[PDB]
Amino acid sequence: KGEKALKASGLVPEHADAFKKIARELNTYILFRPVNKLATNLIKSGVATKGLNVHGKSSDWGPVAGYIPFDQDLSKKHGQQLAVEKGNLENKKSITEHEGEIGKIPLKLDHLRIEELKENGIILKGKKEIDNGKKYYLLESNNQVYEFRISDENNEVQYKTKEGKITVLGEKFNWRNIEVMAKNVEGVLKPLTADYDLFALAPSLTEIKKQIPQKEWDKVVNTPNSLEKQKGVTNLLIKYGIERKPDSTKGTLSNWQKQMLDRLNEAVKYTGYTGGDVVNHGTEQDNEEFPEKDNEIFIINPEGEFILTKNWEMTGRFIEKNITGKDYLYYFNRKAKINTIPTSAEFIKNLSSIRRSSNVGVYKDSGDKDEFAKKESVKKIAGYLSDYYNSANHIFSQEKKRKISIFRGIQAYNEIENVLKSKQIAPEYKNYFQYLKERITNQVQLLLTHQKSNIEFKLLYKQLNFTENETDNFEVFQKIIDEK
Numbered sequence: 244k245g246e247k248a249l250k251a252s253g254l255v256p257e258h259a260d261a262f263k264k265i266a267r268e269l270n271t272y273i274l275f276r277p278v279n280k281l282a283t284n285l286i287k288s289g290v291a292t293k294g295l296n297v298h299g300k301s302s303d304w305g306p307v308a309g310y311i312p313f314d315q316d317l318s319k320k321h322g323q324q325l326a327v328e329k330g331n332l333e334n335k336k337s338i339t340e341h342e343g344e345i346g347k348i349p350l351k352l353d354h355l356r357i358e359e360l361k362e363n364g365i366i367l368k369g370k371k372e373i374d375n376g377k378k379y380y381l382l383e384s385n386n387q388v389y390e391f392r393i394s395d396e397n398n399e400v401q402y403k404t405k406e407g408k409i410t411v412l413g414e415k416f417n418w419r420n421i422e423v424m425a426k427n428v429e430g431v432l433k434p435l436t437a438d439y440d441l442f443a444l445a446p447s448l449t450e451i452k453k454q455i456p457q458k459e460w461d462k463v464v465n466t467p468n469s470l471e472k473q474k475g476v477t478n479l480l481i482k483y484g485i486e487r488k489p490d491s492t493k494g495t496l497s498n499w500q501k502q503m504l505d506r507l508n509e510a511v512k513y514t515g516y517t518g519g520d521v522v523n524h525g526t527e528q529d530n531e532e533f534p535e536k537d538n539e540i541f542i543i544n545p546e547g548e549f550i551l552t553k554n555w556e557m558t559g560r561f562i563e564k565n566i567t568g569k570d571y572l573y574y575f576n577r578k579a580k581i582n583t584i585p586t587s588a589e590f591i592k593n594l595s596s597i598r599r600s601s602n603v604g605v606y607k608d609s610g611d612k613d614e615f616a617k618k619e620s621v622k623k624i625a626g627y628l629s630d631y632y633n634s635a636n637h638i639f640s641q642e643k644k645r646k647i648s649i650f651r652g653i654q655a656y657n658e659i660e661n662v663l664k665s666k667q668i669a670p671e672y673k674n675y676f677q678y679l680k681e682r683i684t685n686q687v688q689l690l691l692t693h694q695k696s697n698i699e700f701k702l703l704y705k706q707l708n709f710t711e712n713e714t715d716n717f718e719v720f721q722k723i724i725d726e727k
Contacts, residue, residue: 248551252541253280255287257515259549265510266545270450271503272566274442275541276527282309282437284359289517290351291426292438295491295524296341297334298532301437304365304384306356306391307400311435313422316389316412317402327412337424346425348432350399357382357393366391374418375401392418433518441526442540444500448572448635454499455483470717473638473647480635484574494522495529497574528576528585531592542566559583568641573634580682581689587628593675594621603669605662613666620662627655645694646724650717652687653704656680696724 249259266273278286279301286292286309293299293311300319302308307317315330323330338345353359360366368382380395388411392401401418404410423434452460459479466472484497496504508520528534540558542550542565550565552558559582567573577586598604605621606614631651636644659680663673688700696703703723709716 244551245548248539248541248549251539251551252278253283254278254541255283255515258511261511261514262543262549263547265507266543266547269503269506270447270545272445272545272571273543274444274526275543276440276442277537277539277541278439279309279437281305281363283439284356285309285352285436286439286521287515288351288353288436289515290436291428291433291518292521292523293435294438295530296337296345297424297435298530299330299334299437304360304386306352306360306366306393307350307402307421309437310350310352310421311424311437313424314412317421322411334424344426346427346432346434347422348425348434350421350423351432351434352393352398352400354393354398357391379418438523439521440524441494441522442542443526443566443576444496444503444574445566446503446572448570448637451499451572454502455479469639470714473636473643476635476638477633480633484635485577485629491525492523494525495577500574526576528589531588534585534589556581567634570637570641575632577632578682578685580686582686584682584686586632587625590628590679591625597671597675601669601671603671605665605668605672617662617665617668620658620665623658624655624662627651627658631655642694642724645690646721649687649690649694650713650720652683652690653707653720654709654713656683656687656704657709659683694724695727698723 248254249256262273265271282301297311299311299315302318302321304321305317311334312318313334314327315334316327318330320327320330338347357366357368361368366382366384370381370383371378372381373379374381374392377395379392379401381392382390384390387405388408389404390402392403393399394401399420401420403416403418406415406417410416425432425434446454463472463475463479466475487495487497489495493501494504504522505520507522511521512519524530527537536555538552538554540552542552542561544550544565550561552561562573562575563582565571566575575583577588606617628651631648633647634644636647659676662676684700691698691700691703703720707716707720
């Protein structure tokens with residue numbers, strides 16, 4: 244929060260002042276991911292940064308830690324049993340799939356970086372061995388299965404494992420280099436650095452009116468009906484915001500948030516970075532190959548107080564205190580799921596996660612109409628969960644957001660009840676749907692108790708009958724909320 248986040252993240256102070264100027268002149272809650280200081284030294288060195296072509300995470304030891312090495316054993320793949328070749332062939336695929344901006348260059352790092360690692364207390368510049376015809380700059384480490392050899396007169400690392408001990412990869416190499424994957428800046432020698440990443444983004448919707456076209460905002464203000472005005476804003480957001488474009492070098496943003504990103508990219512050139520775009524891949528949940536979870540988030544407020552969190556429940560608490568529970572644009576990263584269960588795209592990910600391993604399930608690769616009817620049921624599930632994950636219901640108060648949230652939970656629970664009115668499905672998806680419906684009952688239940696409803700869930704389910712209408716059955720449900 245201010246200074247403690249700025250020191251425990253290891254964030255660039257001139258970039259901190261630049262981000263305060265960006266937040267002051269653009270009024271956006273800039274969410275961020277935790278960055279490694281060992282990567283931050285090579286970021287503030289100025290050379291190019293990685294995207295999603297490589298996937299090397301931040302290491303825990305090394306002068307090259309932060310760069311993406313050829314052999315990934317100077318990367319996140321440290322001590323991995325069968326995953327060192329996963330990272331190895333992953334950077335092979337980075338070389339041989341994304342041609343044009345992936346290079347084969349030598350290293351670009353600091354010679355005093357070994358002293359930057361000895362002031363970190365990691366490597367041990369000790370005994371010297373003779374290779375390349377010279378008494379070379381062989382330096383040891385603490386973890387002595389590996390050692391770096393940064394060159395004396397050159398700016399390269401001819402690293403090796405010791406020739407008289409075992410390698411954790413299973414091979415043996417004699418003072419080989421890091422043939423580091425690069426970014427071909429029309430021929431400029433620039434390797435890849437572990438980039439500074441995003442977490443989400445959140446402007447205010449009144450500012451968003453001055454970014455998206457607003458003569459349909461001059462249309463949508465002249466309505467006499469409240470829920471239909473909210474549904475017109477729903478039409479505006481379904482055709483404007485979430486209609487995304489999948490990439491791997493810019494990110495999963497709105498086009499106006501892509502303008503936010505390229506403004507962020509240009510506004511850091513004169514501050515101390517020599518490459519421009521330092522944010523070159525997606526957020527925490529945008530790595531859909533496998534998600535992760537962090538314990539602190541560098542959310543930057545519009546007014547200069549760089550907010551920090553402590554626990555994941557405190558992340559949800561301060562998001563529903565600041566991002567969600569105000570009149571802002573909560574645009575997040577799409578049995579203790581107290582508030583935020585994952586999104587419906589990850590529900591489709593879990594749908595494919597046990598439809599390929601076990602080929603049986605809800606509907607098969609077929610042509611019959613009942614299979615497409617269960618496909619229509621899960622289509623309504625995937626629609627209703629993204630309807631539930633639409634926090635832009637706040638042109639009115641936020642209890643309207645609460646009422647529409649519990650309404651969408653009711654409708655999705657009705658769909659999960661409908662999908663068990665089907666044929667003899669595989670029991671894996673049966674207990675999966677039991678899991679979904681029980682977590683959604685717990686979610687709508689505590690969402691009701693944080694309201695002042697005092698009704699149990701089963702009463703409120705059995706009273707509603709939405710045959711053809713979310714227009715007066717919302718008035719049926721809505722009337723109870725309107726009174727006590």
